[PDB]
Amino acid sequence: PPRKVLIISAGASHSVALLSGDIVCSWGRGEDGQLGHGDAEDRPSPTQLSALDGHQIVSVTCGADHTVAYSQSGMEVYSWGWGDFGRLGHGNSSDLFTPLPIKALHGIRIKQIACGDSHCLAVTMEGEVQSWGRNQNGQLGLGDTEDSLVPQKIQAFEGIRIKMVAAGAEHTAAVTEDGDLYGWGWGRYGNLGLGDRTDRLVPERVTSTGGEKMSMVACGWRHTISVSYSGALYTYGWSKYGQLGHGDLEDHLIPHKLEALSNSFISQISGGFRHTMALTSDGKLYGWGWNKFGQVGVGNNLDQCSPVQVRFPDDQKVVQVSCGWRHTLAVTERNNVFAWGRGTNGQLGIGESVDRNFPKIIEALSVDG
Amino acid sequence: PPRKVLIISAGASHSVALLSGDIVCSWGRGEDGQLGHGDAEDRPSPTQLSALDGHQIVSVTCGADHTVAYSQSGMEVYSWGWGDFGRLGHGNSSDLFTPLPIKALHGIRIKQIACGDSHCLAVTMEGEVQSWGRNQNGQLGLGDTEDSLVPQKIQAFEGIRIKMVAAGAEHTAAVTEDGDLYGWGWGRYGNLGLGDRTDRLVPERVTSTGGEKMSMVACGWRHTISVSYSGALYTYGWSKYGQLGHGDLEDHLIPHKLEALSNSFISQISGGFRHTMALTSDGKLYGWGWNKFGQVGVGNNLDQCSPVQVRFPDDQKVVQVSCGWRHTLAVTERNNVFAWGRGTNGQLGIGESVDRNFPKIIEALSVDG
Ligand SMILES: [Mg+2]
Ligand SMILES: [Mg+2]
Ligand SMILES: [Mg+2]
Ligand SMILES: [Mg+2]
Ligand SMILES: [Mg+2]
Ligand SMILES: [Mg+2]
Ligand SMILES: [Mg+2]
Ligand SMILES: [Mg+2]
Ligand SMILES: [Mg+2]
Ligand SMILES: [Mg+2]
Ligand SMILES: [Mg+2]
């Protein structure tokens, strides 16, 4: 039996999966060390990350050109890839071509990890947040603009339990257990949701939320997506490529409900470089935004400023989706994994391949063919 | 009369040359439009940029993932590649896969162009400077931290004739006609030469220059190089990989004379991502810094913290050199062009190839084979 695919994650030009039996595999661009195989070569097919065999990994998360993973039983976080600005969290700027433990996080109960371009954040089981990496625009939420090579606690969240965090190029977002939404970091395109285009050095609460509490948040490069308790979808920030999905190319400075999906309950969301994906509770995947390389997955190369359903063989329902910069990954109910978009770094995982504008199955990881 | 290479320039992962007959060609990574051929594909061999045939281009300059060129007779500056933050100068953020004229610069007599990661500068024949692109850390020299989608004049240089400018990832430097040296922008690794680790939003004069006037300046990603009237070489900023060249790994916050080359007169300089090149008046090329991919050109893959001479067949003298992020380009007295370092995007111009750690001849552009 082909191992169940438990988690997928996409970076700028690479792809990572966690499979049952606790094995990690990676593919795509390898030049910065983001695949973790020791060498610097691109891999066009899923390749087992041997250094993590036996380490009981339960999650993996891609940044633009780096990757983070963690083990619950080992109480360890690992990172590898481009090391500049401290994004790997080891107290230095060195690139890593094989995983190493983030010593500062050893023994800490991790709930969730998010990775942006050059900064990362971890949420603990007690709802505290630690952040590290580039901080030139306050994206670490630490109250200044100095980069951090090691994780630091966000003191601004003292007394406020955090449920999940998200990170874009140079901005950050979070939702609390009580349903509050926050933004901070680089804010020039309205992507913090605070009603202006200025940065924040500490988390600031988003007050315009359509009267709704929020359960989920995700970040694209310069846009942000959230989901409410009623399953409504909100987008804000940059829409040069229509990635907000409102049927035009206008930016929004506060969360704006995507009315076209109002009859659906959204269960998962992902933000890409200039595109966006949302998954409904009945397993339908919608994509929109930039489609130059086919990354929307709708079988053409027209940009899309409104949500369009991504179709799969036999209409099999989708269970996970993750956006890269120029590609998209998805897992279905049948335990098939699909990829589409740009394929030049091997990130689609289907062997040497032309770009694809509709879903293509990754046979190496899938039950079907 | 046989085809000669007149000018070469290296970007992060691409390479561009101007040939006799006023022909522009390019090779290497194509994904962001930086090659200018209209498509997004890598080219492993030199490819003529036909859209500029007949435009009488006289110079080309690569940024990380974009390219600029200009024509005297046409009084036109052109740009193409990744468009974010306004680095192409057209008053919008659109990528370009084909050269477009920078309307704001039409009819201006151009002396020199410099390109960083996300910002560019142009010096006019009267010694004025215009800048455009990313400005988050003050690198445009305009007194603020707001990006500019079009060229703007640096008013700080009113009454001060600028000779040449240079741009790194997020910083900028300049020398005046009477030999003063300036720095501005992101300054966290001491790379401005001002004695601290703090950014500047407007040009600030470097006061500790060994009592010497400077004739030229160049920038690497986070380091800076200058040459005095007496041909002495100075480096400052980041030396994590030994790219300052002083035989150790210490950062310098003010210019520091590279003593090992004191008996040579330096004629040309270039800064890469994490490596450096300097050429003597006798045609000897020296390289140092990060050498993971062989980009120092000395026949191994060990980093070099002191200058080592790059050797060429029959000891032919070098006349031009340009550093990319992971590769290096050079032209010799025999009108041969050589390349070395990372080759995975086709940036060496030698057809499909493994990485190279010593100079390899580009047959398409050379007399010898
Ligand atoms: Mg990149
Ligand atoms: Mg995850
Ligand atoms: Mg601090
Ligand atoms: Mg290829
Ligand atoms: Mg073409
Ligand atoms: Mg201004
Ligand atoms: Mg440079
Ligand atoms: Mg000493
Ligand atoms: Mg250079
Ligand atoms: Mg290859
Ligand atoms: Mg690449």
From Swiss-Prot, chains A, B:
Effect of residue 184 to A: No effect on function, homodimerization and interaction with COP1
Phenotype of gene-disrupted mutants: Hypersensitivity to ultraviolet-B (UV-B) illumination. Abrogated induction of DHU1 in response to UV-B. Disruption in a plant lacking DHU1 alleviates its hypersensitivity to UV-B.
Effect caused by changing residue 133 to S: In uvr8-15; loss of function and interaction with COP1
UniProt source species: Arabidopsis thaliana (Mouse-ear cress)
Role: UV-B specific signaling component that acts as a UV-B photoreceptor and plays a key role in establishing UV-protective responses in plants. Upon UV-B irradiation, UVR8 undergoes an immediate switch from homodimer to monomer, accumulates in the nucleus, interacts with the photomorphogenic repressor COP1 and regulates the expression of the transcription factor HY5 by associating with chromatin (through histone H2B binding) in the HY5 promoter region.
Name of the protein: Ultraviolet-B receptor UVR8
Record localization: Nucleus; Cytoplasm, Cytosol
Primary subcellular site in the record, as a coarse category: nucleus
GO MF entry, a single one: protein homodimerization activity
Intervals holding RCC1 repeats: 1-19, 20-72, 74-125, 127-177, 178-229, 231-281, 282-333, 335-369
GO biological process: entrainment of circadian clock; response to UV; response to UV-B
GO CC annotations, alphabetized: chromatin; cytosol; nucleus; plastid
Binding partners and assembly: Homodimer in the absence of UV-B, but absorption of UV-B induces monomerization of UVR8 and interaction with COP1. Interacts with RUP1, RUP2 and histone H2B.
Keywords: Acetylation, Chromophore, Cytoplasm, Nucleus, Photoreceptor protein, Receptor, Repeat, Sensory transduction
UniProt effect for mutating residue 27 to Y: No effect on function, homodimerization and interaction with COP1
